Design a protein around this ligand. Structure first.
Ligand code: MG
Length: 194
C-alpha cells in the first residue's frame, strides 16, 4: 500500500535551473546514455565544477534525504522531461539514495517516455493498484506543468488533500513542505519519532 505521495519536478525544482537551459547542455547530453553507476560517476568532477545553478540545491538535497527516511509511509515520484540517467547521476553525485524513488523521465530516442506528459504520468501512477487516497504534495517551477499534475489528481479522484507549490528556482520552501508532510501524515510522524 502507498497512501502518501510526493510528486516533484526535477529541473528548476530540485535543481536551480529551468529545464530548457539544461536539457541541451553538453553535460546533460553526455550523461543521457550513461546507464551504470560506474559510467555516471566519471562526470562528478565536471558536475562539481559547473555553474551552481545546475546543481541540486542544498535545501532540496536535505528534503530528499529527510523524506527518504519516511519510506515506506511516504513515496517520492520524480516526473521530468529530462533523461533518466542525468537524474540518477545528479542524485548519485549528491549521495542521495534513489533506490526507492520512482523516476518517470524522457523516452529514449524516438520512443516517448512517461515524464513527457505530466498529466498522464500522474494518472498512470495513481491507477497503480497499490496507490490509495491520502496526502499529495506537488512541486513544479513551471506553473502550467504543476497545474497539469494537479489536473491528473483531480481526474483520478485523488485530489482530497493536495499541497501544490509553484516557486521560482531556488525559492522553494522545503522545510515548510516537510512540516506539511509531518502535520498531514500521522503514521509518517509516528515512525519518524519512535
Ligand atoms: Mg522544471
Amino acid at each position: 500500500r502507498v497512501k502518501n505521495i510526493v510528486y516533484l519536478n526535477f529541473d528548476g525544482t530540485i535543481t536551480g535551473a529551468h529545464g530548457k537551459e539544461v536539457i541541451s547542455s553538453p553535460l546533460c547530453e553526455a550523461l543521457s546514455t550513461k546507464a551504470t553507476f560506474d559510467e555516471r560517476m566519471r562526470y562528478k568532477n565536471e558536475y562539481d565544477a559547473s555553474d551552481n545553478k545546475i546543481k541540486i540545491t542544498e535545501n532540496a538535497k536535505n528534503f530528499l534525504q529527510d523524506v527518504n527516511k519516511l519510506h515506506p509511509q511516504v513515496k517520492i515520484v520524480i516526473i521530468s522531461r529530462n533523461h533518466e540517467n542525468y537524474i540518477k547521476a545528479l542524485l548519485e553525485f549528491e549521495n542521495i539514495d534513489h533506490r526507492n524513488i520512482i523516476i518517470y523521465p524522457r523516452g529514449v530516442g524516438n520512443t516517448i517516455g512517461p515524464g513527457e506528459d505530466k498529466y498522464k504520468a500522474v494518472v498512470s501512477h495513481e491507477e497503480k493498484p497499490e496507490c490509495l487516497p491520502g496526502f499529495r504534495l506537488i512541486c513544479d517551477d513551471d506553473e502550467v506543468d504543476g497545474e497539469e499534475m494537479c489536473n491528473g489528481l483531480i481526474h483520478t479522484g485523488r485530489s482530497q488533500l493536495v499541497k501544490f507549490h509553484n516557486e521560482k528556482p531556488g525559492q522553494f520552501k522545503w522545510g515548510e513542505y516537510f512540516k506539511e508532510i509531518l502535520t498531514n501524515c500521522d503514521i509518517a510522524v509516528k515512525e519518524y519519532l519512535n
